[PDB]
Amino acid sequence: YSIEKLKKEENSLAKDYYIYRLLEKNKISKKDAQDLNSHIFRYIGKIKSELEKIIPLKPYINPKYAKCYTYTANTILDANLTCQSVRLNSLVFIASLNSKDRTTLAQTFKNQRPDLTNLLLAFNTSDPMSYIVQKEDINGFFKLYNYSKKYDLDLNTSLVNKLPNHIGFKDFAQNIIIKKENPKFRHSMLEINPENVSEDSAFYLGVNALTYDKTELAYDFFKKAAQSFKSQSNKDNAIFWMWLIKNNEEDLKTLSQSSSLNIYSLYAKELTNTPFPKIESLNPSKKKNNFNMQDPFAWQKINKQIRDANASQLDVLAKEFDTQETLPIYAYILERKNNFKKHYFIMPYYDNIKDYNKTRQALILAIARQESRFIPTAISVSYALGMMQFMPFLANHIGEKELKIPNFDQDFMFKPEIAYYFGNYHLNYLESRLKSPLFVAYAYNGGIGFTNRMLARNDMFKTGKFEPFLSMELVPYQESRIYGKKVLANYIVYRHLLNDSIKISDIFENLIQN
Ligand SMILES: COC[C@H]1O[C@@H](OC[C@@H]2COCCO2)[C@H](NC(C)=O)[C@@H](O)[C@@H]1O
Numbered sequence: 001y002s003i004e005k006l007k008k009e010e011n012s013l014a015k016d017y018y019i020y021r022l023l024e025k026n027k028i029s030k031k032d033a034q035d036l037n038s039h040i041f042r043y044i045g046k047i048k049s050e051l052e053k054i055i056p057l058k059p060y061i062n063p064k065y066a067k068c069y070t071y072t073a074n075t076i077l078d079a080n081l082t083c084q085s086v087r088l089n090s091l092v093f094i095a096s097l098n099s100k101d102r103t104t105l106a107q108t109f110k111n112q113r114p115d116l117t118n119l120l121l122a123f124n125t126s127d128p129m130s131y132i133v134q135k136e137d138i139n140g141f142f143k144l145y146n147y148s149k150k151y152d153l154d155l156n157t158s159l160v161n162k163l164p165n166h167i168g169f170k171d172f173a174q175n176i177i178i179k180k181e182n183p184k185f186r187h188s189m190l191e192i193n194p195e196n197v198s199e200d201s202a203f204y205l206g207v208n209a210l211t212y213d214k215t216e217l218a219y220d221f222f223k224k225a226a227q228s229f230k231s232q233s234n235k236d237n238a239i240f241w242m243w244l245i246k247n248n249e250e251d252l253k254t255l256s257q258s259s260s261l262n263i264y265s266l267y268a269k270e271l272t273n274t275p276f277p278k279i280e281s282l283n284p285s286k287k288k289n290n291f292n293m294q295d296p297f298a299w300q301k302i303n304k305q306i307r308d309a310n311a312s313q314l315d316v317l318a319k320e321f322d323t324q325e326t327l328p329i330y331a332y333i334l335e336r337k338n339n340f341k342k343h344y345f346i347m348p349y350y351d352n353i354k355d356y357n358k359t360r361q362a363l364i365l366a367i368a369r370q371e372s373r374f375i376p377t378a379i380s381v382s383y384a385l386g387m388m389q390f391m392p393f394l395a396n397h398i399g400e401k402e403l404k405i406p407n408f409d410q411d412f413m414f415k416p417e418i419a420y421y422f423g424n425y426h427l428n429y430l431e432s433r434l435k436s437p438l439f440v441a442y443a444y445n446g447g448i449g450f451t452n453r454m455l456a457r458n459d460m461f462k463t464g465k466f467e468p469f470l471s472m473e474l475v476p477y478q479e480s481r482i483y484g485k486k487v488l489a490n491y492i493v494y495r496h497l498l499n500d501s502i503k504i505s506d507i508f509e510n511l512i513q514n
Pocket of ligand 1: 369370371372373378379380381384389445479480482483
């Protein structure tokens with residue numbers, strides 16, 4: 001695909017991927033690059049930095065404030081008042097001023113922008129955070145946290161109960177709790193009233209409370225999380241903690257009867273001798289249609305239609321894709337169509353894995369379901385490719401240096417036989433070092449480097465009251481924390497479907513090392 005032919009396709013991640021391929025091979029000239037912004041679906045990350053080696057953007061500054069950016073720390077007192085206030089939106093700029101000018105500006109702004117005044121005078125002290133915390137300036141607090149994460153201080157009950165009202169609070173709480181940073185902030189957040197938080201914030205504050213062995217406060221946070229969470233899966237995670245902490249048997253019962261299939265509801269079913277949830281069975285009699293499952297542009301198109309279809313239009317697409325050849329698209333449509341109420345665990349291109357042992361089949365399928373929902377031409381925002389969502393670098397190393405496939409191209413990852421084969425091969429390497437399918441999942445998504453670093457710590461996946469569940473809440477990258485939970489549920493299910501059942505309790509026991 002030449003740049004001219006790509007330009008005649010709709011904007012999409014696939015079109016981006018292919019533009020990126022031209023760029024990394026140095027095939028986009030300065031002239032081709034001129035009209036190219038408008039041809040990129042998602043102008044973020046690698047494709048942006050690559051295009052910018054060819055055509056910098058010096059942008060962007062609002063024509064109105066242009067003259068404000070002609071001043072520096074040394075001339076800011078010569079600027080009009082509007083220009084003065086615009087420049088003071090940057091804490092680095094404020095930090096750069098000398099203290100006499102911070103004093104002068106603080107007076108200028110006392111009446112109309114006391115927020116600026118507080119930051120100006122704060123930077124005249126040796127601890128600006130302490131000054132801001134004494135004023136209980138909430139906006140100031142978050143601006144300082146965003147400026148530097150190194151500030152750490154005890155916060156009293158009144159102040160910490162004000163933080164949750166700011167949009168920055170949820171990321172602030174999450175970051176410092178899962179990174180184990182800012183201990184004085186963390187300890188202080190024990191005194192946040194559960195009434196003042198909800199949803200993810202409440203949940204993280206429950207995890208925080210467990211790390212300090214405040215199990216009652218933890219129960220109260222998790223219970224507020226349970227009552228406010230929008231998604232049933234997250235609600236289940238909170239109900240699980242409520243149960244582990246207090247062992248009210250109504251909590252476990254509610255979790256065992258959840259409509260969401262996840263590790264918590266599966267475990268609850270197993271603890272209460274409740275039957276395994278019903279898994280749908282999709283077996284279309286019709287064998288093929290016109291659709292090319294190997295065309296990534298056709299997937300981007302159909303995917304957009306499916307996501308924008310009303311309750312009614314799905315039914316038309318369901319019927320059209322009700323074939324063996326488009327099984328992955330059928331199940332994808334059905335999953336949306338039934339508003340996530342039914343459980344679909346398909347096994348497409350099964351011939352390519354039927355000779356592996358069943359445990360290996362389940363792990364493969366478990367990864368694929370989460371990675372791509374088995375869409376052969378799936379492309380991620382980082383341009384991970386195919387059913388098993390290989391990054392190009394690893395695909396080329398396996399494809400070219402290890403397996404030496406003749407005329408290998410990274411787009412071979414779009415073929416099911418290749419995806420399953422490379423997945424099997426990579427999963428072999430991970431399993432041999434890590435053993436648990438959870439740990440393999442973490443390493444598959446996040447790399448074996450971060451997984452090995454997490455498992456070398458003395459406070460992760462070791463023995464303890466609430467292990468291994470607590471450790472699973474403190475996995476330091478959000479995407480990997482989530483990924484491992486979802487893939488582990490998938491794994492349990494597929495082991496069951498393949499008549500190679502395991503108790504999820506056995507999985508959890510083998511996460512604790514000594
Ligand atoms: C937390 O999981 C990380 C993986 O998420 C996948 O996204 C899930 C999607 C949602 O859309 C339908 C298919 O499943 C990513 N896959 C894609 C195509 O973006 C995957 O790359 C990522 O590792």
